[PDB]
Amino acid sequence: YNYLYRLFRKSNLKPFERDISTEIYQAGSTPCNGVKGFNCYFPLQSYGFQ
Amino acid sequence: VYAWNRKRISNCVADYSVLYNSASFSTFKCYGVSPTKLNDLCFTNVYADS
Amino acid sequence: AIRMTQSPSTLSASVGDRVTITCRASQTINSWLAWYQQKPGKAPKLLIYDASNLESGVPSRFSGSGSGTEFTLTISSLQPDDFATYYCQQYESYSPITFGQGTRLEIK
Amino acid sequence: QVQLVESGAEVKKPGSSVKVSCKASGGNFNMYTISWVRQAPGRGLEWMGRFIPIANKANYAQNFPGRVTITADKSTSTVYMELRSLTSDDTAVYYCARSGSYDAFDVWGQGTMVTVSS
């Protein structure tokens, strides 16, 4: 699980741009305030290679 | 569950955001498409297996 | 389940000498191997990771080498503070992680 | 400076169950995995299981089929490891280790002494 890919972002990356922000992505109207839950998703998702 | 009801939905406008922010749905896992992008796409048919 | 074997299990040496510890694996675990140091009554602390790197804060006298199936931990200048039990991890398969049998270093 | 604090010493009877805790303080809890390592007296370290916060999954050692069930509360960054069917051979210090950055147990908890006897 050391390899993580970003799954949610506001806008597509510009060419050759690194964004390593792990702030919770707000997918709904209600603010998340740094707490993941309903309409609040952690942007990074692991692969889990076996 | 062994006799799950299947309903075919077509020829209509689906407000997926309204359905999303309607109640306390314990799971909204969308595979193959982000939930927020659903209003930007068109589907030939929608099957509602309940 | 990958089995880890250490050699020697018990070793004795004096201050300032050279100490070599061999921890041999059963399967090819590439270079995924960590060396620890557990003084009695204390939680083990990381010394070597990836079988060659040095953990931050660890004295430079600790050096690790080896890859594949046989690895080696070597201390350039043994110190009185460096007498404890050293284990080797095999973080190449997480089902289950197997530590070493324990290499206790004693004052000669 | 990430610090891991566990629960107090636990004394149980054979055939019962125990559940220790590991409070993760500092850093990001959603990326580093917490692994439980036990050490019986007079014996080397032994690995029990791993909790994977990023994938919300829990793994257990092959030598412990169904004996270990690991859960955690991501809101409070506290990891709970449950061991079932305690016996006389399960008297060991149950450390929790953070396999951070390079998959190595860089940060170790203080360790709780779990004693199983009559």
CATH number at residue D109: 2.60.40.10
Shortest CA gap D20–chain A (Å):
24
Q: How far apart are CA B14 and CA B7, in angstroms?
A: 14
The experimental technique behind this entry is cryo-EM
Cα-based torsion angle of the residue sequence B17, B19, B23, B27 in order, rounded to the nearest 10 degrees: -90
**How many domains, in total, are found in chain C?**
1
Q: What CATH number should be reported for the domain holding residue C51?
A: 2.60.40.10
Q: Does C87 touch chain D (CB under 8 A)?
A: yes
Using a CB–CB cutoff of 8 Å, tell me whether D103 touches chain A: yes
Residue type, D18: V
Closest residue, chain B, to A28 (C-alpha): B21
Q: C35: buried, middle or exposed (CB in 10 Å: 19+, 13-18, 0-12)?
A: buried
CB neighbours (10 Å) of residue C63? 14
Domain coverage including residue C79 = 4-107
> How far apart (Å, rounded) are the C-alpha atoms in residues A21 and A5?
12
Range of the domain at D78: 3-116
- For chain D, state the CA radius of gyration: 14
Residue pair B39/B16 in contact (Cβ under 8 Å)? The answer is: yes
Q: Count of CB atoms within 10 A of residue D14's CB?
A: 13
Amino acid identity for residue B28 in this structure: F
Would you state the structure tokens that stand for residue B40, as one six-digit string?
Answer: 């930007």
For this entry, resolution in Å reads 3.5
> CA D19, D22, D25: angle at the middle one, nearest 5?
160
Domain count, chain D: 1
